[PDB]
Each structure stands twice: as C-alpha cells, then as structure tokens.
C-alpha cells in the first residue's frame, strides 16, 4: 500500500512482529548439533525434513521470494527510512538478512525443494549484485547447488560470468570458489560444459586468482666503500672499477641465472639501502636505489630498457666490463669490453653513500677488479676516474659484506642484530 | 634489540651447546622450547620497509567511512599528536604500450609538473596528508571527460600531496628528493 | 610482424631450412611478464619440423630466421600468434607473445 | 561392529541398502552359534555362544534391521532373520526380555508393520507357473530354476521368518504373546 | 571515462560506482618478515689474490612466491602461514583447480599445468615448511592433473581378469608356495590384459593439437624416487614423535604422501625391486605398528586392499596357467 | 603371511581404540572378512575371468579401451561431445571382431548393464515432455538389440531388464526414424524366438502393454497433430508397434504359445 503510490500512512507495518517471527522460524529450522546422540540426531533430522516438506506444500518459499521481491526495490536503509519510517528503515537490512537465512534454512537439506524451485535461479543470480544481500544470496545459491543436480542443468554462461564478476568486484571471497566447485561437480559426476566455462572464463587473464611462480634466490656482494658527496669535504666525485667472470651457466636449473652489476645508493646517510625486502628474486637495478646492467638491458626500478651496443651479448664467461661513476653533472656509466655502452642513468638523486654491488643467482664465479693492492686493470680508466682501493679511507681495512645483513648459511650461532647508526660521520670552529 | 645491539638466540637442538641448562632446568622438569623438532625455527622478525595495509576498524587516530549524486570515501581522526600519512588506493591503473601521460588539474585548469612517461606501468592512486585536528580530505571518483579522481581537501592545504604512485616503500616527512632516474 | 633480439650468438652459419627439423628450448612469457609456458620445466627440448604449420606462425617464422647455438627473444603479434580469440583457457584474446628460444640441434 | 550395524540401520533412508558387509558378517554371527552330560554341556555352550553376542547389542540390531526394511523381502531380511534364529535358538528368556524391553521403551510401529508387510508377501505356490515350467521342460531340457523352480519363492525365507516369530514366543512368554496381539 | 571504469571488467559504464575492493590503504609499519631457513652459500676467496677479488656461488637455490596482482607484490609461499585469509583463499584456489579437472577432463588439465607450473608441484610436495593446507592441496592437484585419470582407468579394470594363452603366461603355473615360502604380493609376472598408459606432451606453441585426449606428460621416475625418499624420512620422523610434523599436524604429513604413494602403486609402477623395498618399508617382523591417526589408517586400509587384490589376481593367473 | 599380518593389525587397532568415522571401521572389517574367507574372492572373480588366445591380444586391448571410454563417459553428465564419443565407442565395439567370437566375454564385462544405465540416464528427466538425445537412445537400443541377437544367453540377460524398459517403451514411437532401435524393439529382440523366455514372460506386463495399446487406440498422437495431420480419433503407429511386440511374444518358432 505504501510502495505502489503515495498514500496516507494508516497502514499496518509489523516490523518488530515480523522480525521476531523470522527469528523464531530460523530457530525452528535449526539443524541439530553434531554433539548429540545418534538416535536423537536422527529424530531431529526426520522432524526437520517433515517440517520442510510441510512448509513446501503451502508454497511458502514462493511467499518469502515475493516478500524479498517487494523489499529489494529499495537501495539502502536511508532510502527505506524516509519512505517507511525510521524504525523500518534501520531494520530493513536485518529483515533482509533474516529472510535470506530463513530461505536458506528451509532448503538446506532437501533435494526435493531444490529440484522444485530450481526455476528461480535465473532470479537470484541476476540480483546477486545487490551488495547488501550478496552473502545471503551466495549461501542460498551454494546450498541449492550442492544438493540437486537439476539446478546445475540450468546454469548458463551468463550466470558463470555474473559469479566471476562478483568475485572480481568484491575481492577474494572463499565462498565464491566453493560455489564454483559445486558447479563443476555435484554428485560424483562432472559437467564438462561448466568446467570448460570456468576454465576459459576465470583464469586466462591471471589478474585472478592469486598467481604463482618458482624463482631463484639472489644475493648481492658489496665492498666497504661509501661515497657521500656534499658541500665541503669531497672525494673527487670520480670512481671506476672493472669486473670479470670465470665460469657462468645460462640456465642452471630452470630459469636464467641472475647476474647484474652496478652502483646502489643508501637510505639517507646510513647503510641498508631501500628496495627489495631481502632474499628475493631482485638484485641490483630492481629498485630506485640501485642501477645495474646485465649485458642487454639497463635496470632501474625493476624496469628493464634494452640498449644498443656492438655485438649484443649477455655476461658470458671471460667477459671484462668497466664501471665509471661521476656524481654531480654526469652519471653512472658502463663499458662492455672496453667501448662504452649507449645508455646511462642521468639525473638521479645523489643523496646517499654509493657503493659498487653485484647480484647473482647461482653457478657463478665473479671477480672484482680494483688496482694496486686488490688486482690489475684490464683496461685504462677514463681520465679523472679513481678506483675503490683509493676510495677506501686512510688506515681502515676493506672487505666485502653481502649487501645488508648476515645472509650466511649458518646455524643458530648467528649474530642477529638491531638498528645501527649513520657511521657517526655521515668545517673548522668559527 | 636497540641501536647497535647484536645477539644470539638458542631454542635448543644442541644440548652440547646449551651451557647452563644443566645448572637449572634439567632437574625441576624444564625442557628447551623446541626440543622435539627436526628442523630449525623460522625466526620471524619485524620487517623495516612499511608496505601498505587496509585501514583497520579497530584503529585509533584514523577513521575511514564509506558513503553513497557521486560516491566518496571520507576521513576522520581524533588525536592530540600530528604526523604525515601516506594513504593509497587498493589497486592501480594500468597503462598500455601507447598511452603515457598524466595531467593534474586544480580548481582552475591544468597547471602542474610534466609527469608523462610510462611505457608499461601500474600507477596506484595516492595522497599524502598531514594530520590536523579536523581532517576531512577525501577522494571522489568524478567524471568530466575521462578518468578523474578528486582528492578534495579542506582548510590548511599546503603540505598535502595527491598523485599516482607505483610500488614505493619510504616513510619520511619530505617534500622533494623523491627517487628518480632518466635512462638514456 | 615478429621481431628478434639476439642474446647469445649462434655463429650465423647453419639456419633452419625447409625439409628439416629443429630442436628448440624455450620459455614463453606473456606481455606482462607472467610466464605461460616453458620447455625447461619438463626437461625435454621441443622438437618440431619446419614448414608443415605444426606450430604457431610467430614461432615458425622466428625459428626460420635463427641459427644453431643461438639464444633469441621473439616478440610476436596477436594476429600472427593466436588471433583475436587466443588460446582457450591459457592465452587471453589480443595478447602479444614473448619467447626465449635457444637452438640446440639442427637435423 | 554391532554399533556400526545398528547406526546404519538407524540412519533414516527410503530403502535398506544391499550392505554386503552386513550380509557377510550376519552369516558369520549366525554360524557362530551351534548321555546327559554331553547334552547339558552343549546346551550350556550354546547359551554361552549366544551370550557372546547378544549382550553386545545384536538383539536390538536385528530388530532395527527388520524395522529398517519396511516390509521388503530381500537378502537383508533373509540374513537378519537367520541371525535372529541363531540368537534365539531354544528358550532364550534373556534375549526375549531384551527384545521386548527395547520394543516397549522405543515405541516404534516400523517393526510390527514391517513384519506384517513381510508376511503379506512371503510365498504361494502358483499352478500357472508350475504347469508352465512343466510345459517348458517337456518342450526342451531347460535347466532347473534355482529359487525352488520359481513356483515357491523364498520358502526358506518364509520358514525362517515364522521360526523367528515362533521362537519369540517360545516357552510361555505371556507378556510378549499379548504384545504380539 | 571513469577511474573505476578502467581497472575492472566493465568499461562501457559511465556511472562512477565504488565496489568494496576499492578501499584506501595507509602506509603502516605493522608487518612481520620471515627468515629463509636456507641461504645461498656464498663463499669469498678470502685470499685477495693479485688477479682480483673472487666470490663464488655454485649450489642452486629456488623458492616459490605468490603474486598479488591488484597490489602488484610478490610474497614467498612460506609467509602464508601467518596470513589466515590468503592461506584459506589459496587452499580453496587449489581445490577449485582440482575440481575443474576432477574427472577425465584433459583440456582443462593441459591448461592448468601451465596455469601453475610443472616443477613447483615437485618443489611443494618435497618442501618441509609447508602450511599443510597447501601441502594437501598441491598433492591433490598433482594427483588430479596427471595421475588421476589413468589411476581411475586402471582401477576400472581391476575386477576383470582377461588372461592370454602366451608361453610367458604358461610360466607362472608354479606360483611359489612349496619348500616353505609364500612369495610377496605384487612380485612376479602379470601377463594379464591391463590398460596401457600414454601421456601427451603439454605444448602451447603447437597449433592444432591432434586430440590431447589422454593426459599431460609428467616424469614418473623422479616422482617415484621422491615418493620413496619422503616416505622414508616421514616414517623416520614419525618413529621419534617430534612436535613439528611436516605441514603442521601428523595427518597433514602422512595423508597426502600416502595418497600419492597409493595412486602411484595403482598406476602400475614400482617394478619388483621397488615393490620389495616398499614391502620392507612396512613389513619387517615399521609403519603398521606406529600410532597412526584415523585418515592415515584409512588410507593404509586401501593399501592393504590393493595388496590383497594383486594376490587374488596372481592366484587367478596361476589357476588359468595350470588349467591350460 | 600377509593374511596373518592383516588379521593381526585389523583386530589390534580396534582393541587399542574406539574408532569413529564409520568408513574406517567398515573398511577394516571388510578387509578382515576378505582375509578370513579367502575363497570368496575366488568364487566372486572366476565368474568374471576369461581367456581368449595368444595371438589376438591387441584386438581385445582395443575392446577394453573402448569399454573404458564408455564407462568414463557414463561417469560424466550427458552432453553433445559426450554423446558423440559414446556413439563412436559403441560403433567401435560393433566393428570389433572379438564381439562375436567371445559372447561370454561381453556378459562377463557387463556391457549390457553399462549400456542399459547409460540409456536410463538419457530416458530420465521426463516421461512425455522430452525425449532428448534420440541418437544416443537409438545407439543404445541397437547395441542391446545386436548384443542379445548374437547369442543364446544374452537374450536371458536382457530379459531381466525387459521389465523396466517396457515401462518407458512409449518413447521412440509415432516416428518413422528408427524402425529398429527402440526399447520396445529391444524387448522384442530379447523375447524373440525362444519358447523358454516366452513362457517365463509372466503377465505383470502383457496387460501393461494392453493398457498402452488401449490408450493408443483411444488417443490420437499429439506429435502428429503438431506435425499437421488431420487428427483422426485414434493412433495407428504406436498401436502397430505394440501389436508387433505382442505378436513376437505370442508366436514363437512357428507354434503359438498357448498360455500367452
């Protein structure tokens, strides 16, 4: 009387009465608990089946279906409140939930009920996108799909698309997957049509579901060199070192062996540069605080850009490469077998304490090439560019840690460590 | 462990290296924590990089509400201390091979930096807001001619930023000095 | 429409030619980097005879322009690889294909 | 095992399943059971053999299996009746009292109406089938029908059922005689 | 036209709606990381030789990671133990993968082999720090994609004994039972008509596959050797009753492994020497005498059922051989 | 010693613990019963064993593959590719050479039951509102017809199912599209040319067929009226089929069966 048109509100709307009746009916159709005697549980099951059949005979499932038909024409509690009163508006959602729970409970165990009103699944799936009754509609759909194979016979391509779109719109819901499983198999018998539809409509795109892959462990190796450029004390802003490899394997087990090298920044004036968490498939160049090169592409922020160079190649065995670092006006420069490559990372932030670094996956023998006390140079550095063995501070030892932490294959006797300081040093008195 | 603190942990598995277990514990019926195990403990730690998380309802000094004409997702806070916050949307916009441009239009017309470079990326919408006593700056998906998000601010809008960002895990109160590099 | 990166050289002397079989070893990958196929997971090289259209046009033509002992990255187009329908279930419609093919032997 | 069979018979269904396990184990249970000292010793050991399985629930299990058939002549009832015969051989007053107490404490009609349905369709000789088989034999050497030449169907089952109904009243059990009426 | 209309399924809708997936995320520090229990084994030369600074890495190491696409982030498999929602969702994803190819559906199985991997199934079944639910799910997926079809087909002809009249058939008439011996179940000559096994190679570059009507190919020798290894150290671990069974509780350790072993035994592998080793893995008078849970003994009952069925088949074959 | 060990462990477990999950206890007791009876397996399996020869092994392998495909398609819901594969398998079983030399092997493998309740799945769903997959029904009917034709005992085997298929024999009538394949026609082929089976044909179902004939002679065919026929007040097609079946039931080997 209120929904058809604007009429004077001398109408009976027993909101609390119908809510109490719905709760009482939900309790009336309660399945027996599993912590009961077998005989009593069977008696309760038989009584519940008799009650469900008697309710079916009066066609009251259709009655609650038409009740939710008349009640779903609104959009929200606010929409219902100004039309049917504040109490009805604020109880509308609860009434919808109770009605859907009662509908599910009336049909939870029956095969006959599901076969009887399977003809209404075109309706429920169409209104599944209510967004305030989606859980109840999904529960009813699952409990009607599990029991009667007749319901599966009328499931069409559009319903599969609707369910997949509901999953893609509402997120990772584990009940949608159960519904899909029930659609695929009902009673020891499979539906090849539904299986094929789900297979070719759910995961060609890989945006869903949660993807998966097997990758290789990668770690880095860096020496005790820190390079901080600022006003005042400067270190010539020019560095250079070479690199060679003894043995390498293009594919050791299943994927291409990671092998990159470059210069990595730091966080402020402290070690532990930002980027990958640690123990990943990401080395140097897979973040914005490291810039690496692997022979074909320039890596920066896990985005590779291929670069031209005479005789394109990966870092095969017996390959000598050179790395130059200038800080202020130019940037990090690479040379493959003497002649420079045709790409380099200009206009990058100079904040941080830069250092050389090399990342590898497995099956590799790497040799840093510094001068003087640490080795020879296979090629002549460009003018001005010094090396790391001179970059080391006067009267301090120089060794090579991995990149950040104790990435050592060791037992419980590992020195597990907390935060550190910014070296306490990274102008005369007036 | 605090600053410059290094230690060692022993859950068992080496009774030959459990030094003072024989002094105390072995007599009054105390066992090592993981004595009946065949493999070492995973040893979880507090990770340092602050990745994004969904706003928890049971979180104070932060409240996000959803309403809905046009839709929006409004904010609120009740706190006595202020900081800078790095709110980000759930999932990003993917740019194909050809398309590569981003224009920021204020209350007037287009007037911002030339951020138009993306061969194939995923820009996640975000805004970095300073916490005020009353902070209602929120996001509204609007429509003029194409994809358009309006991060509507309120009074005291001078250090809040609104843009689209890829995976970036850096917690600090700064304006510029953002990580960047131009490959030639 | 298919294009090639050389990654490791294959001494450019022996090519797959009509009336022959080629032994390749590949790790196919989608445009977004999500791997969809690989011949190294099953630990057996892929043997295919050239000229009888038993593989897709992209792989066929890319292998036709390769050499023994070479590594190549083949970038293909949807029309030359799978068309506007793609592979049902695996390859989405209108998707570009990336293959990391290494040539082992040439009968 | 008895509890498993009892729960299977107690679970609500529409028809009693074949349950080859039950059919096989009722066989073994029935065959487990069976000049003055040599006749008293065998009677005492028969009582002991019946006690070996009637205090573990077989007396109620047989009744539940009979009630779960709703009057359908088949191998299930054919085996449970043999088990009842084995468990009720002689005047087993303890077993009779257990059965009567169970029936009275669980006021089920599904046992007595099942018995009535079973007896309504036991067996009758049919002259049509008999003379028809005679004609078939005269026309050609047809192999004899296994189930009593198809003229008397499950005569052994009928004899076992009526032997069960008799052993239930064996002695002078007036309480159960009046209960049967 | 809209922000929301670009990163979802639909694009022709100009109405700016906000589905529940669109939730604001704030950069927070409440997060835990996990230490890998195995490291890369990086060794430095430590000599500082005159020809350079040498570092070495020879031993391979691999791990598997989920890729949350809407967050564009990769997370190790072992980190799912703490995350309850992702754990349950991926378990149900594995269940759906099994369901879409449960019965003899081979096109979907061919799709699913690439949809996950070939070798990560081996990695997951071999790994020890598995959440348990994913261990069982990956075991079931490995069974369903490759072994389930032929295992079912061979179980379909289990109760039918068609025996040829070849000379090799006329050789087991002795059925060794005399001079104080009984033989071993499944050991000897079968010479009985059984369905053959043949698996098609999964290739997605081969246009116009003929029928792919049988199965995706899977290496069986590696799988059976690994099954032997895992059963051996599983019984070794269960003998001492440790407090960290693989996959959590002991049923997660035993039920999927025993199920894979059982279906491998059904398939018609483990030739006589392998069958002997498996027999001495249980029989010496092991695994029957252990305190096993209900599902574990339920599976081992099926194992004994097959061990009796093969004896029945051997008896039938010997009877036919003598009858000839 | 396997029987000894299994009898050891099965009773040991039940002695140690009270066991929930009735499936486990059922399996344990089935195993124990198998171990003790022993010869039960032999007496259950020898009726299903068979031997053919040492030369035709690959032919019967093709037979077994076809039967396995048929059973796998039985285990899957009814469809277009399903019916095509089932028809191809049935045709392969037709053209098989072993299908003739060893008719006892067909009964041992139970092909008749398999095709019976392949066809029951199709015939279900409805009674007089849908007869879908008519080609599948026809292939099943012709397979059963030929299988019972080339024998003396497959007729007896199909006589057991004759009672059920007469209930739904109304399908496939009033259409000259399969003059052969029909449940009524396979009933006729089973009862065909055997006075033993004709006598064993009791009369629960003769008066059933009489009711069907009376209904056919009273009612016209809704099918034909939808076709566009002038709607004569009776149906002469289904009645003719029923009369043919009754003729085959009554007249056998040139001598009328007196009781029938």
Curated annotation (Swiss-Prot), chain A:
Channel activity is modulated by phosphorylation. Phosphorylation is increased in failing heart, leading to calcium leaks and increased cytoplasmic Ca(2+) levels. Disulfide bonds: none annotated. It is found in: Sarcoplasmic reticulum membrane. Highly expressed in heart, lung, cerebellum and brain. Detected at lower levels in adrenal gland, stomach, thymus, esophagus and ovary. Disruption phenotype: Embryonically lethal. Embryos die at about 10 dpc, due to defects in heart tube development. Cardiac myotubes display enlarged rough endoplasmic reticulum and cytoplasmic vesicles that contain high levels of Ca(2+). Residues 165-375 form the B30.2/SPRY domain. Coiled coil: none annotated. It comes from the Eukaryota. Belongs to the ryanodine receptor (TC 1.A.3.1) family. RYR2 subfamily. Cytosolic calcium-activated calcium channel that mediates the release of Ca(2+) from the sarcoplasmic reticulum into the cytosol and thereby plays a key role in triggering cardiac muscle contraction. Aberrant channel activation can lead to cardiac arrhythmia. In cardiac myocytes, calcium release is triggered by increased Ca(2+) cytosolic levels due to activation of the L-type calcium channel CACNA1C. The calcium channel activity is modulated by formation of heterotetramers with RYR3. Required for cellular calcium ion homeostasis. Required for embryonic heart development. The calcium release channel activity resides in the C-terminal region while the remaining part of the protein resides in the cytoplasm. This is Ryanodine receptor 2. The gene is Ryr2. The chain holds residues 435 to 868 of 4966 of the full protein.
UniProtKB/Swiss-Prot annotation, chain C:
It comes from Homo sapiens. Detected in heart muscle (at protein level). Isoform 1 and isoform 2 are ubiquitous with highest levels in brain and thymus. The keyword Kinase does not apply. It is found in: Cytoplasm; Sarcoplasmic reticulum. The gene is FKBP1B. It comes from the Eukaryota. Its EC number is 5.2.1.8. This is Peptidyl-prolyl cis-trans isomerase FKBP1B. InterPro entries: FKBP-type_PPIase, PPIase_dom_sf, PPIase_FKBP_dom. PANTHER family: PEPTIDYL-PROLYL CIS-TRANS ISOMERASE, PEPTIDYL-PROLYL CIS-TRANS ISOMERASE FKBP1B. One of its GO terms (biological process) is negative regulation of release of sequestered calcium ion into cytosol. It catalyses: [protein]-peptidylproline (omega=180) = [protein]-peptidylproline (omega=0).
UniProtKB/Swiss-Prot annotation, chain F:
Disruption phenotype: Embryonically lethal. Embryos die at about 10 dpc, due to defects in heart tube development. Cardiac myotubes display enlarged rough endoplasmic reticulum and cytoplasmic vesicles that contain high levels of Ca(2+). It comes from the Eukaryota. Highly expressed in heart, lung, cerebellum and brain. Detected at lower levels in adrenal gland, stomach, thymus, esophagus and ovary. Channel activity is modulated by phosphorylation. Phosphorylation is increased in failing heart, leading to calcium leaks and increased cytoplasmic Ca(2+) levels. It is found in: Sarcoplasmic reticulum membrane. The calcium release channel activity resides in the C-terminal region while the remaining part of the protein resides in the cytoplasm. Cytosolic calcium-activated calcium channel that mediates the release of Ca(2+) from the sarcoplasmic reticulum into the cytosol and thereby plays a key role in triggering cardiac muscle contraction. Aberrant channel activation can lead to cardiac arrhythmia. In cardiac myocytes, calcium release is triggered by increased Ca(2+) cytosolic levels due to activation of the L-type calcium channel CACNA1C. The calcium channel activity is modulated by formation of heterotetramers with RYR3. Required for cellular calcium ion homeostasis. Required for embryonic heart development. Belongs to the ryanodine receptor (TC 1.A.3.1) family. RYR2 subfamily. This is Ryanodine receptor 2. It comes from Mus musculus.
């Amino acid at each position: 009387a209120l929904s058809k048109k604007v009429k004077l509100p001398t109408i009976d709307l027993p909101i609390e009465s119908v809510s109490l009746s719905l709760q009482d009916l939900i309790g009336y159709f309660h399945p027996p608990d599993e912590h009961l005697e077998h005989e009593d549980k069977q008696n309760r099951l038989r009584a519940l089946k008799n009650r469900q059949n008697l309710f079916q005979e009066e066609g009251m499932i259709n009655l609650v279906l038409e009740c939710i038909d008349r009640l779903h024409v609104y959009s929200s509690a606010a929409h219902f409140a100004d039309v049917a009163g504040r109490e009805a508006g604020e109880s509308w959602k609860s009434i919808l939930n109770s009605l859907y729970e009662l509908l599910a409970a009336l049909i939870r165990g029956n095969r006959k009920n599901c076969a009887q009103f399977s003809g209404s699944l075109d309706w429920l799936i169409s209104r599944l996108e209510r967004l305030e009754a989606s859980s109840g509609i999904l529960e009813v759909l699952h409990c009607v799909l599990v029991e009667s194979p007749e319901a599966l016979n009328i499931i069409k391509e559009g319903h599969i698309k609707s369910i997949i779109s509901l999953l893609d719109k509402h997120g990772r819901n584990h009940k949608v997957l159960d519904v899909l499983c029930s659609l695929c198999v009902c009673h020891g018998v499979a539906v090849r049509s539904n299986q094929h539809l789900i297979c070719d409509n759910l995961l060609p795109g890989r945006d869903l579901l949660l993807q998966t892959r097997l990758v290789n462990h990668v770690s880095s190796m860096r020496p005790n060199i820190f390079l901080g450029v600022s006003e005042g004390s400067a270190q010539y802003k020019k560095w250079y070192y070479e690199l060679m490899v003894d043995h390498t394997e293009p594919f050791v087990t299943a994927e291409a062996t990671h092998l990159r090298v470059g210069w990595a920044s730091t966080e402020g004036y402290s070690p532990y540069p930002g980027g990958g968490e640690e123990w990943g498939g990401n080395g140097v160049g897979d973040d914005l605080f490291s810039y690496g090169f692997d022979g074909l592409h320039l890596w920066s922020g896990c985005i590779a850009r291929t670069v031209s160079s005479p005789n394109q190649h990966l870092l095969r065995t017996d390959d000598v490469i050179s790395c130059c670092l200038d800080l202020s006006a130019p940037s990090i420069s690479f040379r493959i077998n003497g002649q420079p490559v045709q790409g380099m990372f200009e206009n990058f932030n100079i904040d941080g304490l830069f250092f050389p670094v090399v990342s590898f996956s497995a099956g590799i023998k790497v040799r840093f090439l510094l001068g003087g006390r640490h080795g020879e140079f296979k090629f002549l550095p460009p003018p001005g560019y010094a090396a790391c063995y001179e970059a080391v501070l006067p009267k301090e030892k120089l060794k090579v840690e991995h990149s950040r932490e104790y990435k050592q294959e060791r037992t419980y006797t590992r020195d597990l460590l907390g935060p550190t300081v910014s070296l306490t040093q990274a102008v005369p008195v007036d | 462990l605090g600053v410059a603190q290094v230690g060692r942990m022993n859950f068992g598995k080496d009774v030959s290296t459990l030094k003072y277990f024989t002094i105390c514990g072995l007599q009054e019926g105390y066992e090592p924590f993981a004595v009946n195990t065949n493999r070492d403990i995973t040893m979880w730690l507090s990770k340092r990089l602050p990745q994004f998380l969904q706003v928890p309802s049971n979180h104070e000094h932060i409240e996000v509400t959803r309403i809905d004409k046009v839709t929006q997702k409004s904010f609120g806070s009740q706190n006595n201390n202020t900081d800078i916050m790095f709110y980000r949307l759930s999932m990003p916009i993917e740019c194909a091979x050809x398309x590569x441009x981003x224009x920021x239009x204020x209350x007037x017309x287009x007037x911002x930096x030339x951020x138009x470079x993306x061969x194939x990326x995923x820009x996640x919408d975000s805004d970095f807001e300073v916490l005020m006593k009353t902070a209602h700056g929120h996001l509204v998906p609007d429509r003029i001619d194409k994809d358009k998000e309006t991060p509507k601010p309120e009074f005291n809008n001078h250090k809040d930023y609104a843009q689209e960002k890829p995976s970036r895990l850096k917690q600090x109160x700064x304006x510029x000095x953002x990580x960047x590099x131009x490959x030639x | 429409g298919v294009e090639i990166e050389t990654i490791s050289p294959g001494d450019g002397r022996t090519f797959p030619k009509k009336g022959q079989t080629c032994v390749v070893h590949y790790t196919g990958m989608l445009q977004n980097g999500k791997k969809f196929d690989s011949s190294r997971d099953r630990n057996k090289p892929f043997k295919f005879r050239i000229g009888k259209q038993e593989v897709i046009k992209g792989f066929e033509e890319g292998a036709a322009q390769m050499s023994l002992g070479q590594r190549a990255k083949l970038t293909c187009t949807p029309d030359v690889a799978y068309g506007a329908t793609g592979h049902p279930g695996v390859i989405p419609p209108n998707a570009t294909l990336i293959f990391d093919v290494e040539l082992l032997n040439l009968e | 095992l008895i509890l498993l069979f009892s729960r299977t018979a107690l679970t609500e269904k529409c028809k009693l399943e074949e349950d080859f396990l039950y059919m096989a184990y009722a066989d073994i249970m029935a065959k487990s059971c069976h000049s003055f000292e040599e006749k008293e010793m065998e009677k005492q050991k028969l009582l002991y053999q019946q006690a070996r399985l009637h205090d573990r629930g077989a007396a109620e299990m047989v009744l539940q299996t009979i009630s779960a058939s709703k009057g359908e002549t088949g191998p299930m009832v054919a085996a449970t009746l043999k088990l009842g015969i084995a468990i009720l051989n002689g005047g087993n007053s303890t077993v009779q009292q257990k059965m009567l107490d169970y029936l009275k404490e669980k006021k089920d009609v599904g046992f007595f109406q099942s018995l009535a349905g079973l007896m309504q369709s036991c067996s009758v000789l049919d002259l049509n089938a008999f003379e028809r088989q005679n004609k078939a034999e005269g026309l050609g050497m047809v192999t004899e029908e296994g189930s009593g030449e198809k003229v008397l169907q499950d005569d052994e089952f009928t004899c076992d059922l009526f032997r069960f109904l008799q052993l239930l009243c064996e002695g002078h059990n007036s309480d159960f005689q009046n209960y049967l009426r | 036209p809209l922000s929301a209309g670009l990163f979802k399924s639909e694009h022709k809708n100009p109405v700016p709606q906000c589905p529940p997936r669109l939730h604001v995320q704030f950069l927070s520090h409440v997060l835990w990381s996990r230490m890998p229990n195995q490291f890369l084994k990086v060794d430095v030369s430590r000599i500082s030789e005159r020809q350079g600074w040498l570092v070495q890495c020879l031993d391979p190491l691999q791990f598997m990671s989920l890729h949350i696409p809407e967050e564009n982030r990769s997370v190790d498999i072992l980190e799912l133990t703490e995350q309850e929602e992702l754990l349950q969702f991926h378990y149900h994803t594995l269940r759906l993968y099994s369901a879409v190819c449960a019965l003899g559906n081979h096109r979907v199985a061919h799709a699913l082999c690439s949809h996950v991997d070939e070798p990560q199934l081996l990695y997951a079944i071999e790994n020890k720090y598995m959440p348990g639910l994913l261990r069982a799910g990956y075991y079931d997926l490995l069974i369903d994609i490759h072994l389930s079809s032929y295992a079912t087909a061979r179980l379909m002809m289990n109760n039918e004994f068609i025996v040829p009249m070849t000379e090799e058939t006329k050789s087991i008439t002795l059925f060794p039972d005399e001079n104080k011996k009984h033989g071993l179940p499944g050991i000897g000559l079968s010479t009985s008509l059984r369905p053959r096994m043949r698996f098609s190679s999964p290739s997605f570059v081969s246009i116009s596959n003929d029928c792919y009507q049988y199965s995706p190919e899977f290496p069986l020798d590696i799988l059976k050797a690994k099954t032997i290894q895992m059963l051996t150290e599983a019984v070794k671990e269960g003998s001492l009753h440790a407090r960290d069974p693989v996959g959590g509780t002991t049923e997660f350790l035993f039920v999927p492994l025993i199920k894979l072993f059982y279906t491998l035994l059904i398939m018609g592998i483990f030739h006589n020497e392998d069958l002997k080793h498996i027999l001495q893995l249980i029989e010496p008078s092991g695994l029957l005498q252990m305190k096993l849970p209900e599902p574990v003994k339920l599976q081992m009952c099926l194992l004994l059922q097959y061990l009796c069925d093969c004896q029945v088949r051997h008896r039938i074959e010997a009877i036919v051989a003598f009858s000839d | 010693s396997l029987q000894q060990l299994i009898s050891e462990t099965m009773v040991r477990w039940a002695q140690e613990s009270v066991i929930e999950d009735p499936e486990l206890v059922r399996a344990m007791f089935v195993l124990l019963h198998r171990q003790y009876d022993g010869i039960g397996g032999l007496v259950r399996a020898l009726p299903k064993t068979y031997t053919i020869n040492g030369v035709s092994v690959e032919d019967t392998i093709n037979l077994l593959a076809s039967l396995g495909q048929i059973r796998s398609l039985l285990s899957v819901r009814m469809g277009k590719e399903e019916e095509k594969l089932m028809i191809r398998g049935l045709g392969d079983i037709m053209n098989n050479k072993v299908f003739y030399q060893h008719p006892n092997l067909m009964r041992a493998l139970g092909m008749h039951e398999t095709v019976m309740e392949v066809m029951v799945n199709v015939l279900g769903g409805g009674e007089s509102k849908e007869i879908t997959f008519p080609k599948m029904v026809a292939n099943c009917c012709r397979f059963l017809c030929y299988f019972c034709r080339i024998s003396r005992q497959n007729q007896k085997a199909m006589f057991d199912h004759l009672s059920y298929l007469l209930e739904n024999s109304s399908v496939g009538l009033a259409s000259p599209a399969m003059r052969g394949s029909t449940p009524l026609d396979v009933a006729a082929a089973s009862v065909m040319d055997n006075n033993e089976l004709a006598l064993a044909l009791r009369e629960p179902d003769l008066e059933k067929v009489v009711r069907y004939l009376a209904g056919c002679g009273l009612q016209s065919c809704q099918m034909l009226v939808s076709k566009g026929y002038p709607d004569i007040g009776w149906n002469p097609v289904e009645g003719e089929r029923y009369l043919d079946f009754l003729r085959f039931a009554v007249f056998c080997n040139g001598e009328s069966v007196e009781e029938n």
